Design a protein around this ligand. Structure first.
Ligand SMILES: [Zn+2]
Ligand SMILES: [Zn+2]
Ligand SMILES: [Zn+2]
Ligand SMILES: [Zn+2]
Lengths: 113, 64, 1079, 56, 57, 113
């Protein structure tokens, strides 16, 4: 996504409606600047997350000895040296499935069934 | 703290066996056998010397 | 092999010794630290320079200034401190600093074997203690939640606040302010959510928004630059929305610095350079960095507040430090020196135009160390008591433990956390009250000292380190950020090489082995800790340097090689110091061997980066002496871990020249029949704590019931478990500036009478007794008087007695007569004295039989002790039974028995070796009842086991009183058996009796057998006024003017006072002998 | 334990109720002296061997 | 109750000074000090009374 | 914390510096001999005594009112052994059968067939 703010007095962008033409506009309440809407989405809540399970996986995630070793095989390079874990979402209501990543691609294949 | 005249457990003397022991060590390099020959059969009288910690030596290095 | 790592361990103590920490941390204060402290906030409206610290001296009247020595100060009750001088600029003597024995400024530090023997100092004495006014004082480690670190706590449903993050800050070197930053977060995880933070001196709390504009960043997106490092994290961003609107009312730096109530705005700055996050540095042109910090904090916050990271583990030892001796002498000093600062300010505020009584720095230090109250003296008790105690000297392993002890100021702290592994001993810790709040350090653990930051800061900003100043979160995606001592010194790109270079630089030894470096890949960060107070242990390095397969760097050549200290063993990259924090990101292998069919008897056994030197090194003094602690119920080990500190033996060898109050020596000691390889370093063989009793676990007379044991009189006569008991009464000849001195004589008559009860006939004319004298009852031990001729002579405590063993007279600095007396006494084990093994199997004597009465075995062999089988099932302590077996073999086999933890020895193995010698494979033997000679229908577990004779012998407890010395304030009896006192009859004892309906008896206690008193009340004003002159009958009671209506009652004097008190508080307790309110 | 313990049916509970306080208080001393004596001659103990499970 | 306790008597005019047995001294035989905690804050009160008066005259 | 935590006992003077108490009365106080100490108080009136024997005597305490059951049984050695001694396999001959009846103070003076 990577949405935007605005130059001149660098602030948050609040949306307003383009009355006479019927369409959405975005603006600022410090100056006057106005740019159209990037997307119709404004806010989302999500009471049953799923984002943040893949939590930062730099390639270096294979030199951290405290991680388990699995001999499966990625959906691309077809290797057999993979590491895994469970969601990093510390939510008492999460589930316990294993996500596996391979040091020779970076997929997120599970073990679930 | 010096050797105990007579063994607590059974009563058998054990005062003399001191110099004898510390010798059969230095030279003859024994334990088990030395003792056996020193006439120290059953573990009861036995443990006395082999468990003795001659502190007196360091004490003697003291002035009065 | 396994037996090899032992030699490695041997190599360690040969050079560092059990008390490294203590000395090392002391020297660090003397050598360096002390200077840096005096040169910071000195100069007064005239500067100060280098300081001189001369050696020990004794300025006493009737002599010049005798160069004093430890072993003397002890006996004469002095102070092992030396002078301190400083060339002040506009030579001078300034206070006496107490040196720490065996350190660096203590002359002993050089003298060799024979050399020392000549200084009277016992070689086995590892020193490490101070000698204030005689008694050996040992500074106790004080734990405290580390500073400068990011945390996050959730705050309960009932509270306007949801979560909160805190960070304690203090200058690692320089004053050390104790002001913490609080960045709260009101509005619980529901309600319609502001974010406020607390600043020093600000009444209310301030909303983060203003704080950004107040720094120098007023527009958005340049702000989220610092906060969020991923424009695509809409979640985080959302939360913030309502907050921006809060500060939307302040659109610039002027009002920003304003609202905090031109004068304030100017003042605002101040509060940013001296109050706002005061650590890091208070310079000037660094504003930028902190902004990135304040962003990284609010980040760490939400990372939890969004259920992505758990709440910070409050008891994660790694985030806790330990202020050893060296550090303490700082925060204490400042408080003083600052009063010294403003003291020299007072002399200048008297000079209407040398003086500096350098005893305030001497006596101040003394106060604390003597009592245990750090914070100055004065009407300031608002300090902490516990610090510095009276070093134990019951047994050697007792004393040891005490120095290696840690405290921890106050249901969750008391827990045994994971982090405690390796660094602290799991068992040794006091029962009841504070239990777990007093931890003892493991053998391998050590504390940091204080290395330097720059030689690694440079080493960074000269290897790939693009400064924080100019950062772009989107341009620089995976930039690995690095933290230094809780500060963010910029990020770094690919670190993998940068990392395994500094760590290799350390292994050669050019950047102290004490620094900590932790890389948290799972977040892309690098923790750097140089700090002073970080506990660390040592581990083996593995490294895959095998281009022909997949192996430990260390070889059998390093081993046999053991100019080669332990410092080289580290200067060769064979061992690393891993603190609790760094531990988090490593993987440690247990057994070196295996972790790189079986017998159905032995114990079932269940990428590697490091190995454990040896598991039996995680223990401290207490558990270290327990044989097979891995065979007993753990909570039991924890008991012996305490009782050990209470047994008898020999605590030192110079003991024959010590004039200390209370001391016990076991007649004939005995090194155990079974031992730990570690004992080899605890000099235990030269200082045993007990004897090997010929145990026999069986039932007999029924006097060995309920944890009470039977002891064979016959061998008690042969000197078994006998012990000497010392005590040392001391006195002085006090004076007054007004020439009035006391005397040390054999007083009699002379107008006063004020004398004691016992006899003085056993007093030679020097006013002292002789060492032959058989003292008893109350007999005066010393003879003193006070002319104002009243006796002030000291009498042997009524309950005690024995024989004098050595008396000695001596001068005092004030040219007074110093005299100490020592009394000896042999203590024989008695049908009541307490004993115990090394397995929490404590018990006292119930009776004592002789050889005949005693049960015996065909061989002849007879037991010295008989404990009951019932003390085994629920106690679960099995190792005891095992210690017995093993020790029954080493006895018969003559070979020393190894008992050390996890080795390759089993009960089935030992059993076969015992079958090779001749006796039953399980120990058991036949026995004939000493009374009839007939065999016992059963067999018994007859075998030699080690037994310590703990102190607490009857004759030190036995107490009985019937109308004795009464207290003064109350007039009830007095406390303690020592003062002939009386037992309390507290609530619970009352209650019971009342249930029994023992009305009268109770009334008879509280009155006849204690207080009681006849008071006269007034029939009109129910008060205790009446002037009852028991002769001329005259009663009276003015104010209500009566003399006719008066009553007599019998009430406890204790109560009468209660009333007088109540009266003195203006409340009026009317007592009526007739009901008046009716109904 | 079941028959001479601090239990309901307890032989003690009954002797107090059926014979009285005195006799039962004495009853102890007897039952004691007797047992202890017997054991004194019959002997009794415990050792590691009482804690090992069969080979198989 | 106008007789046993009237609201007004909750303020003290003349202060009841308690005797030795209430706040005893503990001498080290006889010719040595030893004074109670209260045996200090009484003179302190006294002084705070004296000085007070010596500011009201 | 018990009604039985305080009871009147008959004095028996014996040697050696220690309070010698009966075994069966261990659990009421809930004591052991691993070092435990005990307080003793001494009555003073002529009536006090009666009050001690008529309300605090050990025999009266045998039955605890809280659970309408006793509070003193046969502990350790005596208990453990009585079981053995009871078994059908347990036989005793005249020689011992004599020294045992003698040991019973209450013996009716009649040898059972
Ligand atoms: Zn704008
Ligand atoms: Zn792949
Ligand atoms: Zn023997
Ligand atoms: Zn009156």
């Amino acid at each position: 996504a990577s949405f935007r703010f605005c130059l001149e007095c660098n602030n948050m962008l609040y949306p307003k409606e383009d009355k006479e033409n019927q369409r959405l506009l975005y603006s600022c309440r410090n100056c006057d600047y106005t740019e159209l809407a990037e997307d119709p989405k404004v806010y989302r809540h999500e009471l049953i997350t799923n984002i943040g399970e893949t939590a930062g996986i730099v390639d270096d995630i294979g030199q951290d000895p405290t991680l388990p070793r699995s001999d499966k095989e990625c959906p691309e390079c077809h290797s057999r040296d993979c590491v895994f874990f469970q969601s990093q979402q510390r939510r008492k209501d999460t589930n316990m499935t294993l996500f596996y990543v391979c040091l020779n691609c970076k997929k997120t294949f599970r073990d679930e069934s | 703290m010096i050797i105990p005249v007579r063994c607590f457990s059974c009563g058998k003397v054990v005062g003399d066996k001191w110099d004898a022991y510390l010798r059969l060590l230095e030279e003859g390099k024994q334990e088990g056998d030395a003792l056996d020959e020193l006439k120290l059969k059953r573990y009861c009288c036995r443990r006395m010397v082999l468990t003795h910690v001659d502190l007196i030596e360091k004490f003697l290095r003291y002035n009065p | 092999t396994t037996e090899d790592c032992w030699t490695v361990i041997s190599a360690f103590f040969e050079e560092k010794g059990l008390v490294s920490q203590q000395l090392d941390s002391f020297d660090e204060f003397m050598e360096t630290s002390i200077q840096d402290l005096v040169w910071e906030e000195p100069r007064l409206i005239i500067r100060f320079g280098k300081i001189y610290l001369s050696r020990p001296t004794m300025t006493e009247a009737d002599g010049t200034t005798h160069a004093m020595f430890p072993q003397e100060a002890r006996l004469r009750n002095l102070t092992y401190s030396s002078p301190v001088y400083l060339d002040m600029e506009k030579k001078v003597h300034i206070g006496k600093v107490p040196i720490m024995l065996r350190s660096k400024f203590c002359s002993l530090r050089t003298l060799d074997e024979v050399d020392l023997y000549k200084m009277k100092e016992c070689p086995y004495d590892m020193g490490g203690y101070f000698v204030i006014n005689g008694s050996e004082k040992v500074l106790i480690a004080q734990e405290r939640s580390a500073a400068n670190i990011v945390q996050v706590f959730k705050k309960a449903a009932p509270s306007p606040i949801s979560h909160v993050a805190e960070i304690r800050s203090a200058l690692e070197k320089g004053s050390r302010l104790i002001s913490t930053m609080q960045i709260k977060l009101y509005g619980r995880e529901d309600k319609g959510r502001t974010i406020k933070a607390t600043l020093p001196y600000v009444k209310q709390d301030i909303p983060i928004v203003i704080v950004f504009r107040a720094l120098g960043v007023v527009p958005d997106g340049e702000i989220l630059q610092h906060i969020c490092y991923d424009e695509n994290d809409w979640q985080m961003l959302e939360m913030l929305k309502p907050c921006i609107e809060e500060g939307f009312v302040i659109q610039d730096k002027e009002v920003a610095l304003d609202f905090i109530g031109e004068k304030r705005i100017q003042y605002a700055k101040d509060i940013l350079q001296k109050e706002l996050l005061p650590h890091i540095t208070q310079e000037e042109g660094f504003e930028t960095r902190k902004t990135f910090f304040l962003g990284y904090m609010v980040n760490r916050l939400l990372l939890c507040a969004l259920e992505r990271k758990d709440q910070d583990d409050r008891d994660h030892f790694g985030k806790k430090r330990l202020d050893l001796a060296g550090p303490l002498l700082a925060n204490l000093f400042r408080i003083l020196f600052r009063k010294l600062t403003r003291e020299i300010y007072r002399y200048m505020q008297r000079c209407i135009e040398l003086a500096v009584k350098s005893t305030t720095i001497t006596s101040g230090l003394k106060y604390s160390l003597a009592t245990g109250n750090w914070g100055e003296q004065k009407k300031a008790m608002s300090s902490r008591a516990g610090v510095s105690q009276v070093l134990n000297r019951y047994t050697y392993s007792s004393t040891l433990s005490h120095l290696r002890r840690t405290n921890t100021p106050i249901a969750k702290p008391r827990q045994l956390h994971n982090t405690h592994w390796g660094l602290v001993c799991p068992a040794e810790t006091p029962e009841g009250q504070a239990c777990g709040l007093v931890k003892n350090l493991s053998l391998l653990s050590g504390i940091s000292i204080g290395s330097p930051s720059e030689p690694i800061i440079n080493f960074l900003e000269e290897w790939g380190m693009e400064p924080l100043e100019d950062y772009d979160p989107a341009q620089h995606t995976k930039s690995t950020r690095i933290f230094v001592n809780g500060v963010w010194t910029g990020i770094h790109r690919d670190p993998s090489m940068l990392v395994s270079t500094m760590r290799d630089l350390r292994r050669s030894g050019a950047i102290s082995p004490e620094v900590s470096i932790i890389r948290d890949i799972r977040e892309r960060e690098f923790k750097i800790f140089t700090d002073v107070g970080r506990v660390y242990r040592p581990l083996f390095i593995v490294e895959d340097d095998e281009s022909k397969d997949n192996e430990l760097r260390i070889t059998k050549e390093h081993i046999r090689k053991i100019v080669y200290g332990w410092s080289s063993l580290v200067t060769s990259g064979v061992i690393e110091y891993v603190d609790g924090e760094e531990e988090e990101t490593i993987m440690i292998a247990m057994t070196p061997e295996d972790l790189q069919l079986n017998d159905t008897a032995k114990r079932i056994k269940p990428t590697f980066t490091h190995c454990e030197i040896h598991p039996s090194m995680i223990l401290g003094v207490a558990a270290s002496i327990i044989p097979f602690p891995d065979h007993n119920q753990s909570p039991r080990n924890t008991y012996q871990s305490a009782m050990g500190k209470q047994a008898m033996g020999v605590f030192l060898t110079n003991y024959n020249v010590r004039m200390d109050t209370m001391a016990n020596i076991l007649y004939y000691p005995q090194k155990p029949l079974a031992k730990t390889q570690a004992m080899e370093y605890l000099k235990f063989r030269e200082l045993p704590a007990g004897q090997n009793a010929i145990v026999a676990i069986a039932c007999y007379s029924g006097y060995n019931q309920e944890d009470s044991m039977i002891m064979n009189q016959s061998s008690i006569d042969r000197g078994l478990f006998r012990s000497l008991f010392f005590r040392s009464y001391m006195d002085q000849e006090k004076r007054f500036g007004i020439s009035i001195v006391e005397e040390f004589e054999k007083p009699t008559r002379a107008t006063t009478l004020r004398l004691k009860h016992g006899t003085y006939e056993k007093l030679d004319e020097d006013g002292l007794i002789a060492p032959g004298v058989r003292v008893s009852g109350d007999d005066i031990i010393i003879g003193k008087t006070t002319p104002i001729k009243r006796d002030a002579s000291t009498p042997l405590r009524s309950t005690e007695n024995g024989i004098v063993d050595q008396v000695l007279l001596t001068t005092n600095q004030e040219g007074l007569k110093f005299v100490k007396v020592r009394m000896r006494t042999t203590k024989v084990p008695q049908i009541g004295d307490k004993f115990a093994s090394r397995h929490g199997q404590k018990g006292t004597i119930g009776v004592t039989y002789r050889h005949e009465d005693m049960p015996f075995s065909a061989e002849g062999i007879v037991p010295d002790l008989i404990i009951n089988p019932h003390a085994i099932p629920s106690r679960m302590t099995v190792a005891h039974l095992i210690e017995c077996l093993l020790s029954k073999v080493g006895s018969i086999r003559g070979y020393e028995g190894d008992a050390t933890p996890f080795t390759d020895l089993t009960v089935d193995a030992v059993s076969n070796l015992l079958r090779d010698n001749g006796y039953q494979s399980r120990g058991f033997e036949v026995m004939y009842n000493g009374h009839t000679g007939k065999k016992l229908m059963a067999q018994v577990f007859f075998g030699p086991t080690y037994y310590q004779r703990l102190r607490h012998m009857v004759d030190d407890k036995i107490h009985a009183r019937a109308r004795g010395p009464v207290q003064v304030l109350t007039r009830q009896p007095v406390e303690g058996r020592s003062r002939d006192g009386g037992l309390r009859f507290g609530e619970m004892e009352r209650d019971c009796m009342i249930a029994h309906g023992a009305a009268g008896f109770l009334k008879e206690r509280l009155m006849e057998a204690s207080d009681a008193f006849r008071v006269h009340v007034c029939g009109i004003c129910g008060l205790m006024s009446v002037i009852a002159n028991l002769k001329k009958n005259q009663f009276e009671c003015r104010s209500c003017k009566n003399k006719t209506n008066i009553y007599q009652l019998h009430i406890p004097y204790a109560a009468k006072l209660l009333f007088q008190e109540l009266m003195a508080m203006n409340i009026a307790p009317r007592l009526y002998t007739e009901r008046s309110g009716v109904s | 334990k079941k028959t001479v313990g601090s239990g309901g049916g307890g032989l003690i509970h009954t002797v107090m109720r059926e014979k009285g306080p005195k006799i039962c208080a004495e009853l102890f001393g007897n039952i004691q002296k007797v047992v202890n004596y017997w054991l004194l001659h019959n002997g009794f103990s415990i050792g590691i061997g009482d804690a090992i499970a069969d080979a198989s | 109750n106008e007789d046993y306790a009237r609201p007004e008597w909750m303020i003290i005019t003349v202060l009841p000074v308690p005797p030795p047995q209430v706040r005893p001294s503990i001498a080290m035989d006889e010719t040595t000090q030893g004074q109670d905690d209260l045996t200090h804050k009484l003179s302190d009160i006294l002084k705070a009374n004296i000085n007070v008066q010596k500011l009201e005259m | 914390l018990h009604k039985m935590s305080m009871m009147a006992h008959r004095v028996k003077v014996m040697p050696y510096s220690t309070f010698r108490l009966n075994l069966s009365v261990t659990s009421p106080y809930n004591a052991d001999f691993d070092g435990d100490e005990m307080n003793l108080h001494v009555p003073q009136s002529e009536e006090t005594r009666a009050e001690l024997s008529q309300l605090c005597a050990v025999p009266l305490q045998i039955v605890s009112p809280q659970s309408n059951k006793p509070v003193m049984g046969i502990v350790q050695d005596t208990l453990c052994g009585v079981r053995k001694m009871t078994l059908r396999d347990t036989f005793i001959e005249y020689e011992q059968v004599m020294n045992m009846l003698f040991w019973v103070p209450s013996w009716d003076g009649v040898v059972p067939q």
